[PDB]
RNA sequence: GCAGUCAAGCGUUCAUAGCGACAUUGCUUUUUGAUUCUUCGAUGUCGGCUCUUCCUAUCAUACCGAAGCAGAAUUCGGUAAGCGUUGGAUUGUUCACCCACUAAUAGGGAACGUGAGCUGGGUUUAGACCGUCGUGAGACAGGUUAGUUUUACCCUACUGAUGAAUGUUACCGCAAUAGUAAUUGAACUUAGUACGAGAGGAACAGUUCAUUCGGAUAAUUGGUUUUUGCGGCUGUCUGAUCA
């Protein structure tokens, strides 16, 4: 059992949960829910989405 | 004319008529075949269905591709307070069926089976089983006469039990009364065991155990009056139809000049008796046993109740059976688990299973955290208390 | 699965019915493919025989070298883009459909297969595993 | 000895087996006659290890290694890695490889001295390969095939290559690798030569349909 | 259209393994004739779609018998409809023909099943075009094009849903009776074994899966989304901000 961290939000993805995505250049992407996935299909930059980990590391939150 | 494209039926003629059940509690039509060797034990049990959760276990199956490798599955957790015995009943085998000759009820019925007998508990004088409970003022010579008549007679012995609904987080307050056949040898020993267990608990660690195949009898989730297409799985018609598309187009031939029973019509869907066999128990969990949801690999203390509780049920604080796969009936229904009727040797059965990880995130959203301690570790401190 | 296949494929989701036009993913010169039927399928009235990752389709070619056009050939799917469920839990899917041209026995027409390849197929057709780059 | 062996119906054993000098890697899904050809002629010389790689049953084409090392991909679980760390000796260097440009079986065609890899794979992988295997990594494509582990079998004595190959590139590889190469086929003329067979210093297992004119040339050029 | 008998011959040799002339006896009522018995104060007329049921004269599958059955494949037959009998190109098509899958793509009935079930492509009203024929009006089972398809609220059937009365009321039950469901294939293994001169080349048990069907469910995954729940955006109006 591995707990893989998300690609968009930084969330933790427990087994049997979420989805995986394979970009055609064979980089593998993992999504917790339909939220981070359906923002990934809008080509949103995760550094400007306020609730991801990448944002809250970008501005030293907490 | 013949059909021109000879295709299967729709639906199943053996599940007819598709009408509403007799009750919300489904009759156990058939009990396991008895052997007069084993110690006295029950054949079935009464739980209340809570809801489902995800399980990660290790599939162990030689000849497969996933041998010794992790899989996920869905389990249903059915909630089980310990079920308390109140009476026994013997059946004499006639040439017209097993006619009940007597029944014997216990001394001090609780207020739940006293509530089963009234449609209106608040107005009633609550006087059920007063004059019957007067039969213990003597040594019980009437009562011992009754049990001696069962021992003299009575080929098969069923035991009246009832759930303890007051321990269940429902809002019903009124227990469900039921019969369960016994399997011990020498019917005198059966009714002696039932006499010894009047007003006594029966916990599921005694009837059921790990790895075992059980059946589940329950009443289907109901869906009202349903048309012929989602009820029977029939084709929709093409879009250009006048006067309704979602129908069965040809009912019958010209002859027989009546509509056959076998064609599909519109009507009730749901709320049927369904028996579903060969479900496998993964956990038998004890409520006094803290950390139901830990396992030998998991090792962090948590119960199986998800964060925020089971959706539309509550919190498991009782024993529970935790069984592979889907089960008939929706949440908060009286679900009757049964021992399997045939000894199954199938290598899907007889597999010693032990879990690895039990899901306990919320079922009320996309749950991201298993325990609130892990949410507090991940998310940090908030605007609230500190 | 079917005649000529090594292994049993666990059932995955069917995301390429009859008529689907997949992107041929090797150096065989065909620029795409076109499913006409599915080896191993089943007979149900007014149902399309659909394919999946790992299956073996009968396909034609609608682009590319004209030596490969107008002839019905075997082909084998290596990417799916309709998400299925692996038994270890995760739902995954690829960015786009794909396939590789092959003979009936499973031997590869081309030499190398571009982009990722689902391991549901690389386990099942060994020759595709030999010519594969990225698996999974 | 070129022993005829099939993996349940397959004339390709190189998909399913990894043959080195100190260890041998086999897939679990075969009968006892599949392991007869291994356990009869090896016997008590090298450990033969039952494993799967990344949840696949093609483990000869997912991994790559030599006498001194073994390289596994990223999707290999910790149970499989722990079993490989337990069953193999302390001389081997086992390490996951952080790249998504292929599986390791079709990139690397290496031996105890000189490695040949895929052209598109990067320097951060090449440093790890040269550190783990202790092998100077070179970058060559055989006759246009970008997959050199599928289309070249390599041993310390000799080596087999793709049948439609220019003589000049073979002489260039003879000057570079310092071993003689002969273009030949395997399994009644199958163009894939790396996956049709494996080889080491003592053994060269092939499929059952590899013909006797192919077999004589193989046992001549690998010098068993 | 299907089936018998007789048996000359064919079948290396041999009437009958499989075929079978010359004849002769039937069954059938999915062809088409023959008749015109009912209906002309009108049973809505082709086909596709749709859905149920029945029939075997069984294509597949279960167990078998014969062979010119060595193995494989095939042929002929028995018990048997239990269960299945497909996706497309062209045509309005029934019919047909190919492409392709499959275990197999068997043939039929039910007012040539089925239009208050649909469609209306065809035929078979009124417009128009052509060829042919006719002096002409017009005629063509000759071709092409555009052409309103009404009603169920009744009784029955069926599907579900209640219900008076049998002292009342409640709870647990029994069972007559009616229905019934599962299905087929592939891979490994047996095993490159048996049988074979060689070429080729199985099966029984076991394992793992899969097709079709069916019954359920909702953890996860996808869809829906008037929680108009949160955010954003436009145009206008609340004097502006806030809402």
mmCIF file of C-alpha atoms in Angstrom, chain B residues 66-211:
data_model
loop_
_atom_site.group_PDB
_atom_site.id
_atom_site.type_symbol
_atom_site.label_atom_id
_atom_site.label_comp_id
_atom_site.label_asym_id
_atom_site.label_seq_id
_atom_site.Cartn_x
_atom_site.Cartn_y
_atom_site.Cartn_z
ATOM 1 C CA UNK B 66 -2.913 -10.986 -9.069
ATOM 2 C CA UNK B 67 -1.548 -13.726 -6.838
ATOM 3 C CA UNK B 68 -0.141 -12.360 -3.557
ATOM 4 C CA UNK B 69 -0.965 -8.839 -4.647
ATOM 5 C CA UNK B 70 -3.168 -6.065 -3.267
ATOM 6 C CA UNK B 71 -6.690 -5.429 -4.534
ATOM 7 C CA UNK B 72 -9.474 -3.101 -3.501
ATOM 8 C CA UNK B 73 -13.013 -4.266 -2.863
ATOM 9 C CA UNK B 74 -16.257 -2.874 -1.600
ATOM 10 C CA UNK B 75 -17.738 -4.297 1.581
ATOM 11 C CA UNK B 76 -21.028 -3.620 3.272
ATOM 12 C CA UNK B 77 -20.986 -3.113 7.004
ATOM 13 C CA UNK B 78 -24.157 -4.501 8.557
ATOM 14 C CA UNK B 79 -24.741 -3.357 12.125
ATOM 15 C CA UNK B 80 -25.357 -5.905 14.842
ATOM 16 C CA UNK B 81 -26.452 -5.328 18.349
ATOM 17 C CA UNK B 82 -26.538 -8.606 20.243
ATOM 18 C CA UNK B 83 -29.862 -10.302 19.650
ATOM 19 C CA UNK B 84 -31.864 -11.498 22.620
ATOM 20 C CA UNK B 85 -33.936 -14.676 22.755
ATOM 21 C CA UNK B 86 -37.532 -14.550 24.012
ATOM 22 C CA UNK B 87 -39.186 -17.824 23.103
ATOM 23 C CA UNK B 88 -39.184 -21.111 21.260
ATOM 24 C CA UNK B 89 -41.650 -22.877 19.031
ATOM 25 C CA UNK B 90 -41.885 -26.474 17.881
ATOM 26 C CA UNK B 91 -43.248 -27.803 14.597
ATOM 27 C CA UNK B 92 -44.788 -31.210 14.058
ATOM 28 C CA UNK B 93 -44.236 -32.487 10.528
ATOM 29 C CA UNK B 94 -47.669 -33.190 9.078
ATOM 30 C CA UNK B 95 -48.571 -34.270 5.565
ATOM 31 C CA UNK B 96 -49.547 -30.647 4.971
ATOM 32 C CA UNK B 97 -46.440 -28.934 6.294
ATOM 33 C CA UNK B 98 -44.708 -28.287 9.558
ATOM 34 C CA UNK B 99 -47.652 -27.175 11.676
ATOM 35 C CA UNK B 100 -46.738 -25.234 14.804
ATOM 36 C CA UNK B 101 -48.081 -26.999 17.859
ATOM 37 C CA UNK B 102 -47.036 -24.590 20.609
ATOM 38 C CA UNK B 103 -45.042 -21.529 21.502
ATOM 39 C CA UNK B 104 -43.411 -20.646 24.783
ATOM 40 C CA UNK B 105 -42.471 -17.072 25.582
ATOM 41 C CA UNK B 106 -39.994 -16.050 28.226
ATOM 42 C CA UNK B 107 -40.732 -14.421 31.532
ATOM 43 C CA UNK B 108 -39.727 -10.769 31.378
ATOM 44 C CA UNK B 109 -40.056 -9.436 27.866
ATOM 45 C CA UNK B 110 -38.373 -6.075 27.376
ATOM 46 C CA UNK B 111 -40.266 -2.999 26.277
ATOM 47 C CA UNK B 112 -39.379 -3.466 22.621
ATOM 48 C CA UNK B 113 -41.119 -6.733 21.926
ATOM 49 C CA UNK B 114 -43.772 -5.362 24.189
ATOM 50 C CA UNK B 115 -43.869 -2.522 21.680
ATOM 51 C CA UNK B 116 -44.107 -4.864 18.678
ATOM 52 C CA UNK B 117 -47.604 -5.899 19.582
ATOM 53 C CA UNK B 118 -49.179 -2.452 19.655
ATOM 54 C CA UNK B 119 -49.749 -0.148 16.762
ATOM 55 C CA UNK B 120 -50.231 2.571 19.380
ATOM 56 C CA UNK B 121 -47.839 2.270 22.307
ATOM 57 C CA UNK B 122 -48.645 5.613 23.878
ATOM 58 C CA UNK B 123 -52.386 5.141 24.397
ATOM 59 C CA UNK B 124 -52.230 1.477 25.234
ATOM 60 C CA UNK B 125 -52.341 0.083 28.741
ATOM 61 C CA UNK B 126 -49.128 -1.844 27.885
ATOM 62 C CA UNK B 127 -50.864 -4.972 29.121
ATOM 63 C CA UNK B 128 -49.380 -7.477 26.700
ATOM 64 C CA UNK B 129 -47.940 -10.523 28.516
ATOM 65 C CA UNK B 130 -49.415 -9.854 31.926
ATOM 66 C CA UNK B 131 -51.712 -12.838 32.239
ATOM 67 C CA UNK B 132 -49.151 -14.993 30.496
ATOM 68 C CA UNK B 133 -46.411 -13.846 32.852
ATOM 69 C CA UNK B 134 -48.682 -14.956 35.684
ATOM 70 C CA UNK B 135 -47.753 -18.545 34.744
ATOM 71 C CA UNK B 136 -44.475 -18.196 36.696
ATOM 72 C CA UNK B 137 -46.249 -17.670 40.035
ATOM 73 C CA UNK B 138 -46.139 -21.439 40.464
ATOM 74 C CA UNK B 139 -42.997 -23.416 39.630
ATOM 75 C CA UNK B 140 -43.961 -23.168 35.953
ATOM 76 C CA UNK B 141 -45.828 -26.460 35.760
ATOM 77 C CA UNK B 142 -47.869 -25.135 32.865
ATOM 78 C CA UNK B 143 -44.649 -23.909 31.274
ATOM 79 C CA UNK B 144 -42.871 -27.182 31.938
ATOM 80 C CA UNK B 145 -45.921 -28.983 30.551
ATOM 81 C CA UNK B 146 -45.511 -26.948 27.361
ATOM 82 C CA UNK B 147 -41.797 -27.642 27.010
ATOM 83 C CA UNK B 148 -42.322 -31.330 27.739
ATOM 84 C CA UNK B 149 -44.890 -31.341 24.972
ATOM 85 C CA UNK B 150 -42.277 -29.854 22.655
ATOM 86 C CA UNK B 151 -39.727 -32.490 23.681
ATOM 87 C CA UNK B 152 -42.243 -35.274 23.137
ATOM 88 C CA UNK B 153 -43.092 -33.940 19.663
ATOM 89 C CA UNK B 154 -41.800 -31.232 17.355
ATOM 90 C CA UNK B 155 -39.432 -32.395 14.617
ATOM 91 C CA UNK B 156 -37.834 -28.945 14.102
ATOM 92 C CA UNK B 157 -37.418 -26.219 16.707
ATOM 93 C CA UNK B 158 -37.324 -22.519 15.879
ATOM 94 C CA UNK B 159 -36.414 -19.847 18.382
ATOM 95 C CA UNK B 160 -38.113 -16.456 18.627
ATOM 96 C CA UNK B 161 -35.462 -13.785 18.958
ATOM 97 C CA UNK B 162 -35.472 -10.062 18.606
ATOM 98 C CA UNK B 163 -33.011 -7.300 17.837
ATOM 99 C CA UNK B 164 -32.111 -4.678 20.358
ATOM 100 C CA UNK B 165 -33.079 -1.604 18.373
ATOM 101 C CA UNK B 166 -32.338 0.710 21.306
ATOM 102 C CA UNK B 167 -28.609 0.166 20.818
ATOM 103 C CA UNK B 168 -28.880 0.971 17.107
ATOM 104 C CA UNK B 169 -28.643 4.662 16.134
ATOM 105 C CA UNK B 170 -31.968 4.483 14.299
ATOM 106 C CA UNK B 171 -35.048 6.261 15.544
ATOM 107 C CA UNK B 172 -37.410 3.300 15.620
ATOM 108 C CA UNK B 173 -37.567 2.206 19.344
ATOM 109 C CA UNK B 174 -39.544 -0.919 18.270
ATOM 110 C CA UNK B 175 -37.649 -4.165 17.790
ATOM 111 C CA UNK B 176 -38.162 -6.706 15.041
ATOM 112 C CA UNK B 177 -39.317 -10.103 16.216
ATOM 113 C CA UNK B 178 -38.222 -13.132 14.230
ATOM 114 C CA UNK B 179 -37.684 -16.889 14.205
ATOM 115 C CA UNK B 180 -34.388 -18.714 13.710
ATOM 116 C CA UNK B 181 -34.045 -22.481 13.428
ATOM 117 C CA UNK B 182 -31.395 -24.290 15.489
ATOM 118 C CA UNK B 183 -28.977 -27.002 14.349
ATOM 119 C CA UNK B 184 -28.105 -29.026 17.429
ATOM 120 C CA UNK B 185 -28.737 -32.693 17.861
ATOM 121 C CA UNK B 186 -31.532 -34.372 19.754
ATOM 122 C CA UNK B 187 -34.368 -31.782 19.886
ATOM 123 C CA UNK B 188 -34.590 -32.094 23.662
ATOM 124 C CA UNK B 189 -31.112 -30.548 23.670
ATOM 125 C CA UNK B 190 -32.295 -27.753 21.362
ATOM 126 C CA UNK B 191 -35.222 -26.731 23.510
ATOM 127 C CA UNK B 192 -33.107 -27.156 26.638
ATOM 128 C CA UNK B 193 -30.579 -24.736 25.158
ATOM 129 C CA UNK B 194 -33.351 -22.311 24.267
ATOM 130 C CA UNK B 195 -34.790 -22.646 27.766
ATOM 131 C CA UNK B 196 -31.360 -21.882 29.199
ATOM 132 C CA UNK B 197 -31.036 -18.831 26.960
ATOM 133 C CA UNK B 198 -34.307 -17.052 27.720
ATOM 134 C CA UNK B 199 -33.636 -13.320 28.047
ATOM 135 C CA UNK B 200 -30.029 -13.869 27.083
ATOM 136 C CA UNK B 201 -27.730 -12.166 24.604
ATOM 137 C CA UNK B 202 -26.630 -13.907 21.414
ATOM 138 C CA UNK B 203 -23.581 -12.268 19.869
ATOM 139 C CA UNK B 204 -22.321 -12.808 16.332
ATOM 140 C CA UNK B 205 -18.950 -14.142 17.460
ATOM 141 C CA UNK B 206 -20.901 -17.310 18.280
ATOM 142 C CA UNK B 207 -22.937 -17.757 15.108
ATOM 143 C CA UNK B 208 -20.667 -16.347 12.420
ATOM 144 C CA UNK B 209 -16.917 -16.312 12.074
ATOM 145 C CA UNK B 210 -14.110 -15.182 9.808
ATOM 146 C CA UNK B 211 -13.892 -16.145 6.094
#
